[PDB]
Amino acid sequence: RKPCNCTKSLCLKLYCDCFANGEFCNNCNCTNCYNNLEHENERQKAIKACLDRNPEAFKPKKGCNCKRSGCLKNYCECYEAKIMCSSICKCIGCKNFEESPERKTLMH
DNA sequence: GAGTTTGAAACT
DNA sequence: AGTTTCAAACTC
Ligand SMILES: [Zn+2]
Ligand SMILES: [Zn+2]
Ligand SMILES: [Zn+2]
Ligand SMILES: [Zn+2]
Ligand SMILES: [Zn+2]
Ligand SMILES: [Zn+2]
């Protein structure tokens, strides 16, 4: 959906949101893109290396480790997904919980 | 547009 | 676990 602007990763790593969502890049702004039909062999390699690192990498779709955002900035994957942090999050200084004032203020 | 900040993903 | 890399979020 939204264009990636990768240069260094070739869009063959999870730093690339297009590749992380199991898509070919389309109309993106990436450089040296391998996330496409023209690089099928090398792309397949990246996929399996990506997968044996974590077998759930491309599972149909746990917790943040934010230090400085307070989890009220879109650096927090919880906040970006517009959901609350949970017990599994290893946040520090988390202000992204139900009864949080700052969260409520930033909500309006 | 440039430069800084951030934390997941990667690497050692 | 500590460190580096990376592309996006953010700030100016
Ligand atoms: Zn990309
Ligand atoms: Zn892309
Ligand atoms: Zn790409
Ligand atoms: Zn967070
Ligand atoms: Zn969280
Ligand atoms: Zn949090």
Side-chain angles (χ1 to χ4, degrees), chain A residues 2-39 41-60 63-81 83-105 107-108:
Chain A
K2 314 72 189 162
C4 74
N5 309 266
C6 323
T7 58
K8 213 89 188 191
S9 68
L10 310 172
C11 309
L12 285 191
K13 281 178 187 183
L14 296 172
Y15 306 118
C16 172
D17 291 320
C18 296
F19 179 82
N21 290 333
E23 308 175 38
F24 291 112
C25 293
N26 273 331
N27 208 20
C28 290
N29 305 321
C30 38
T31 298
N32 285 126
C33 185
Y34 276 23
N35 188 31
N36 51 62
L37 298 150
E38 304 78 359
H39 302 78
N41 267 275
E42 215 59 53
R43 177 168 185 264
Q44 275 298 105
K45 274 174 76 170
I47 295 187
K48 159 189 181 307
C50 197
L51 213 49
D52 60 345
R53 287 183 210 133
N54 159 27
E56 316 152 69
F58 310 104
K59 207 183 297 305
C64 71
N65 304 291
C66 310
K67 287 178 170 183
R68 307 215 33 69
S69 84
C71 307
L72 295 181
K73 294 167 164 180
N74 288 292
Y75 308 103
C76 175
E77 252 166 26
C78 294
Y79 192 83
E80 165 175 5
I83 68 152
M84 243 63 64
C85 285
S86 79
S87 64
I88 63 173
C89 295
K90 298 158 186 200
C91 330
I92 291 181
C94 183
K95 297 173 186 192
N96 180 47
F97 51 92
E98 180 68 54
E99 311 80 343
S100 174
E102 305 90 341
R103 182 190 65 73
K104 268 161 175 172
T105 311
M107 200 176 171
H108 307 141

